Amino acid sequence: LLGFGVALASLIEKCSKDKKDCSSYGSFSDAVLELFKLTIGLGDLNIQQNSTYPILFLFLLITYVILTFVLLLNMLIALM
Amino acid sequence: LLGFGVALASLIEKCSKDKKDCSSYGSFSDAVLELFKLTIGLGDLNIQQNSTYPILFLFLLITYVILTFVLLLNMLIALM
Ligand SMILES: CCCCCCCC/C=C/CCCCCCCC(=O)O[C@@H](COC(=O)CCCCCCCCCCCCCCC)COP(=O)([O-])OCC[N+](C)(C)C
Ligand SMILES: CCCCCCCC/C=C/CCCCCCCC(=O)O[C@@H](COC(=O)CCCCCCCCCCCCCCC)COP(=O)([O-])OCC[N+](C)(C)C
Ligand SMILES: CCCCCCCCCCCC(=O)OC[C@H](COP(=O)(O)OCC[N+](C)(C)C)OC(=O)CCCCCCCCCCC
Ligand SMILES: CCCCCCCCCCCC(=O)OC[C@H](COP(=O)(O)OCC[N+](C)(C)C)OC(=O)CCCCCCCCCCC
Structure with missing residues (x-):
């Protein structure tokens, strides 16, 4: 979760032309x-x-x- | 369900400044x-x-x- 979170987040460029648009994976x-x-x-x-x-x-x-x-x-269900 | 329902609900302050906004966990x-x-x-x-x-x-x-x-x-699937 945290590995791909920081990778995907660091892939997104500046917020937007208005600071808030399609910035789901912003930070x-x-x-x-x-x-x-x-x-x-x-x-x-x-x-x-x-x-x-x-x-x-x-x-x-x-x-x-x-x-x-x-x-x-x-695999959690199988081990459980 | 009911334990965390009443805990989360009692954590939310007054409804809103207009009585209806972001009050998903209101009551x-x-x-x-x-x-x-x-x-x-x-x-x-x-x-x-x-x-x-x-x-x-x-x-x-x-x-x-x-x-x-x-x-x-x-765990339900495993016991079943
Ligand atoms: C299959 C799945 C299983 C579950 C997996 C779960 C994995 C974890 C998933 C977690 C991801 C959830 C979202 C996190 C980020 C949300 C944003 C946020 O609040 O940011 C804040 C931090 O927020 C936190 O630190 C979150 C709350 C604490 C950590 C989560 C619980 C810890 C696990 C408990 C376990 C208990 C176990 C039982 C114990 C008896 C920071 O915000 P800011 O930068 O200060 O904002 C500044 C600007 N502003 C102030 C204007 C806003
Ligand atoms: C993995 C999951 C598995 C399932 C888990 C399920 C867990 C349960 C989940 C339940 C949560 C569902 C939501 C409940 C609250 C909704 C709001 C509501 O209606 O409130 C009302 C109560 O409403 C009820 O009492 C709900 C209906 C009866 C209980 C649910 C069925 C009981 C189980 C049956 C089982 C049968 C088994 C088979 C038998 C042969 C009260 O509203 P008010 O305060 O009067 O409103 C005043 C203002 N107004 C009038 C303007 C509106
Ligand atoms: C064990 C706990 C499990 C549950 C999860 C708890 C943490 C959830 C996220 C909290 C984030 C936060 O609040 O701060 C995270 C902070 C600052 O965040 P920011 O970039 O300013 O974004 C804030 C955005 N706002 C303002 C919209 C809220 O560090 C960072 O960004 C650094 C990221 C890189 C270092 C960490 C990498 C980890 C890799 C994996 C290690 C095992
Ligand atoms: C066995 C049955 C299983 C299925 C679930 C059935 C109940 C679902 C919810 C019905 C709520 C309702 O209708 O009344 C709940 C009532 C009054 O609700 P209110 O605060 O006025 O909110 C109404 C909001 N409206 C107007 C928008 C609808 O009590 C309470 O708030 C008291 C809460 C604290 C006491 C109960 C704690 C229980 C802890 C766990 C015990 C095992």
């Missing part, structure tokens, strides 16, 4: 909150960020989904 | 409904409440998520 704690809400399954996944690399953003975000929604949570 | 039954919808996975988690302690609010809300979304539901 660290805001990106950590967005990833937490993808694990719970709440909200709406929005990839149209003010990002310099949309492909690298999708790669890190989909890797996070594969590592937690698929591997870690189902 | 008891409204906070119980919001927690129920986090368990089902519906809605959108909004922590920007008219709260006096945003940190204590996150602590109680994340503890609820750890106790039900992680422990209790997966």
Whole structure:
């Protein structure tokens, strides 16, 4: 959560032309909150960020989904 | 559900300056409904409440998520 939170957050450029737009993954704690809400399954996944690399953003975000929604949570049920 | 419902609800101060704003966790039954919808996975988690302690609010809300979304539901699948 914290590794991909800081990576995704540091990938986003300046806030906006008006300081508040599509800055979901703006800072660290805001990106950590967005990833937490993808694990719970709440909200709406929005990839149209003010990002310099949309492909690298999708790669890190989909890797996070594969590592937690698929591997870690189902492996928790199996070990339990 | 009811323990954290009444705790989170009693943490929120007066309704608003207009009696209706960001009062998701306003009263008891409204906070119980919001927690129920986090368990089902519906809605959108909004922590920007008219709260006096945003940190204590996150602590109680994340503890609820750890106790039900992680422990209790997966342990239900294991015992079943
Ligand atoms: C499958 C999942 C399982 C669960 C996984 C959970 C993983 C964790 C997920 C956590 C991510 C949640 C979001 C964090 C960031 C939100 C923003 C925020 O509030 O920032 C603040 C910090 O806020 C905190 O420090 C959050 C509260 C404490 C940490 C969380 C609980 C710790 C775990 C408890 C466990 C208890 C266990 C039981 C114990 C008996 C900082 O804000 P600021 O920079 O000061 O703002 C300045 C500007 N402003 C003042 C105008 C605003
Ligand atoms: C993983 C999860 C699993 C499920 C967990 C579920 C846990 C439970 C979750 C419950 C939380 C749901 C929300 C409750 C509060 C909503 C608000 C509300 O209506 O308030 C009202 C009460 O409302 C009730 O009393 C709700 C209905 C009855 C209880 C729920 C069903 C009982 C379980 C059945 C089981 C059957 C089993 C099978 C039997 C064969 C009160 O409103 P008011 O104060 O009078 O309003 C005044 C102002 N106004 C009139 C203008 C409005
Ligand atoms: C054990 C606890 C588990 C639960 C999670 C608790 C922490 C949640 C996030 C809190 C953030 C906060 O509040 O501060 C985080 C602070 C400052 O944040 P900021 O950049 O000013 O953004 C604030 C944005 N606002 C104003 C909108 C709120 O440091 C940082 O940004 C540094 C980030 C890089 C260092 C950390 C990397 C960690 C890697 C993994 C190590 C294991
Ligand atoms: C066994 C049944 C399971 C399913 C759940 C059923 C109940 C759901 C909620 C109904 C609420 C309601 O309707 O009344 C709850 C009432 C009055 O509510 P109010 O504060 O006026 O808010 C009404 C808000 N409105 C107007 C928007 C609807 O008491 C209370 O607030 C007292 C709360 C503290 C005492 C109870 C604590 C319980 C702790 C756990 C014990 C095991």
